[PDB]
Paper text:
The main protease of SARS-CoV-2 (Mpro, also referred to as 3-chymotrypsin-like protease or 3CLpro) is responsible for the majority of nsp processing, cleaving at 11 conserved sites along the polyprotein including self-excision of Mpro by autolytic cleavage of its own N-terminal and C-terminal autoprocessing sites. SARS-CoV-2 Mpro is a functional homodimer of two symmetrically disposed protomers that are each 306 residues in length (33.8 kDa). The active site of Mpro features a Cys145-His41 catalytic dyad, which orchestrates nucleophilic attack at the carbonyl carbon of the invariant P1 glutamine and the formation of an acyl enzyme intermediate central to efficient peptide cleavage. Using C-terminally substituted Mpro chimeras, we have determined X-ray crystallographic structures of Mpro in complex with 10 of its 11 viral cleavage sites, bound at full occupancy intermolecularly in trans, within the active site of either the native enzyme and/or a catalytic mutant (C145A).
Unlike the C145A mutant, obtaining crystals with the C-terminal P6-P1 substituted sequences bound in the wild-type catalytic Cys145 active site was more difficult, with only two examples observed for the C12 and C13 variants. Finally, an additional product complex has been observed in the C13 WT crystal. Interestingly, in this case, the electron density unambiguously shows the Cys145 γ-sulfur atom to be oxidized, resulting in an even more dramatic steric/electrostatic repulsion of the product carboxylate out of the complimentary oxyanion hole (both oxyanion hole hydrogen bonds lost as well as the stabilizing interactions with His41 Nε2 and vdW contacts with side chain of Asn142). Remarkably, despite this significant displacement from optimal binding, the P1(Gln) side chain remains bound in S1 with its side chain vdW and hydrogen bonding interactions maintained, as well as the P2(Leu), illustrating again the anchoring power of these positions and importance in Mpro substrate cleavage. C6 (form 2), C10, C14, and C13WT have also crystallized in space group P21 but with a distinct unit cell, two molecules in the ASU, and a unique conformation of the donor substrate (we term here form 2 - see also below).
Residue numbers in the entry:
A (entry chain A), B (entry chain B): 1 to 306
Write the structure that this text describes.
């Protein structure tokens, strides 16, 4: 029993974290086989960051300008190139601790584990969801750039996020490992215009099912609604529309509890309209939206048949 | 910026987790040097669990009754002994991945990372706090026994918790790595109600300081309180007493913000008497008590002088 925000065990990723220094800037990089991946703004001076000509800045650099440290050992850089906002440093040594891995681009609403690093050294691990406005609500200090987000899918590490920036509102922005930003953001010091954030409805419903599986049932009502009526109410509360695909992926949880998805929607509608009665659900006084249906299935052992 | 429940990176502990099987019971063990530590109730049948005499149960066991698997590799058991509620299995091979480590017994209010494991395989990682009633509000399923809690001090893993049991209320209980339970609990199927859980006041104050450092200030007021008048209020709401030692450990945060501890206590007194009136603090609608003063110092970069 119990329900907690849980991250993947981070060991396979820890063995890939290195420190990258260029000039006086130090941040983290990801060493997979004979390539280190890191944010390209490691090459910028303060002046460059106001209006960076990255293509010209990278040409001006030489391999000897990149200091790559893997624990106590310096790795020799023997080539460099750029893919969108990620710098790729070729090193003369392949990482023997490279895990089976893939680079994936996640969708809003999806969750992943963040390995926060400083000075090439892993510091903490926490679960995050990609917000509908493509930001993440993380905890990061200076030196965290290059920290990565990932999921473990069977025997493979699926890297989905590289940290690049904190917006002035205190939320975070980054790229996939092909160097493309999530959201309309750029790696420079300039106005960055995040969309209004919204609540991830399918995840809230998943978490209400987790509550029921754990015996927290007070908020259930016997009513059921239509998908269209639910969406009319929920969008007044800045919730994302619920789609038939969302209904379908909640199916394992509706099966386990015997509570139809549109019956749970009517329970959520009443919570939004009338509030949480001064009560908690799974230890929270607010509706939680950073747990996906699969996060709930895995933590509650829902997928067994007996 | 940001404030998140964060666990330590788990890799140093992942390298120590093994599977231990006795009869048809399988659970997890912790392999350090040439010893594997696990809950002693791995030797019990269903009948035994109702009323075990562990010394007598262990006399009839031989080294060959213990199957220890590290990956797809069996470890030869060459001795077995019991220390309080932990079984120690001597194996013929020292774990080459043993980190620097120590065994510590933590206090209520203290936080630690849990590496939840199944079949000797790490599954997820999360932060939790020891409750004043010596229970932990964890997330554990059948097969999690043997999972461990820990803190890291740069290079040293301080092991503080081994998981043994879920009470019928859904909370968890376990031992330190010397086998002594936290709290009045026993490794037997028998009634064992936990004491009343109370709120960890010093941690709530630390979290209010985290909020101020992150820009949430709406709850600060011009009221003042003595320590005793604060405790007279807090105890009415099942908060632990705040002592002068707690006031001192909040020193770094009262220094960073310029807000005296007793002035923050006056803010807490008003929140307790009146609620938050439709507001949130650091994204929560309740007063959070599972972050220690040092958790706040570390995420909020408080321990620098410039
Ligand atoms: Na309903």
């Amino acid at each position: 029993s119990g329900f907690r925000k849980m991250a993947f065990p981070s060991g396979k990723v820890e063995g890939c974290m290195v420190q990258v220094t260029c000039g006086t800037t130090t941040l983290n990089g990801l060493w997979l086989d004979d390539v280190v991946y890191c944010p390209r703004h490691v090459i910028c001076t303060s002046e460059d960051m106001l209006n960076p000509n990255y293509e010209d800045l990278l040409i001006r650099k030489s391999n000897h300008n990149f200091l790559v440290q893997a624990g106590n050992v310096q790795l020799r850089v023997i080539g460099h190139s750029m893919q969108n906002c990620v710098l790729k440093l070729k090193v003369d040594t392949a990482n023997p601790k490279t895990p089976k891995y893939k680079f994936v681009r996640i969708q809003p609403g999806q969750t992943f584990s963040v390995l926060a690093c400083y000075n090439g050294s892993p510091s903490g691990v926490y679960q995050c969801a990609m917000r509908p406005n493509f930001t993440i609500k993380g905890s990061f200090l200076n030196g965290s750039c290059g920290s990565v987000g990932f999921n473990i899918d069977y025997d493979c590490v699926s890297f989905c996020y590289m940290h690049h920036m904190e917006l002035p509102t205190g939320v975070h922005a980054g790229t996939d490992l092909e160097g493309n930003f999530y959201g309309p953001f750029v790696d420079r010091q300039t106005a960055q215009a995040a969309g209004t954030d919204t609540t991830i409805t399918v995840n809230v419903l998943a978490w209400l099912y987790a509550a029921v599986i754990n015996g927290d049932r007070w908020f259930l009502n016997r009513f059921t609604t239509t998908l269209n009526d639910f969406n009319l109410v929920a969008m007044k509360y800045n919730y994302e529309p619920l789609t038939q695909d969302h209904v379908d992926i909640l199916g394992p949880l509706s099966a386990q509890t015997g509570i139809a998805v549109l019956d749970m929607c009517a329970s959520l509608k009443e919570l939004l309209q009338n509030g949480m009665n001064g009560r908690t659900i799974l230890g929270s006084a607010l509706l939680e939206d950073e747990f996906t249906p699969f996060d709930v299935v895995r933590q509650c052992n829902v997928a067994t048949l007996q």
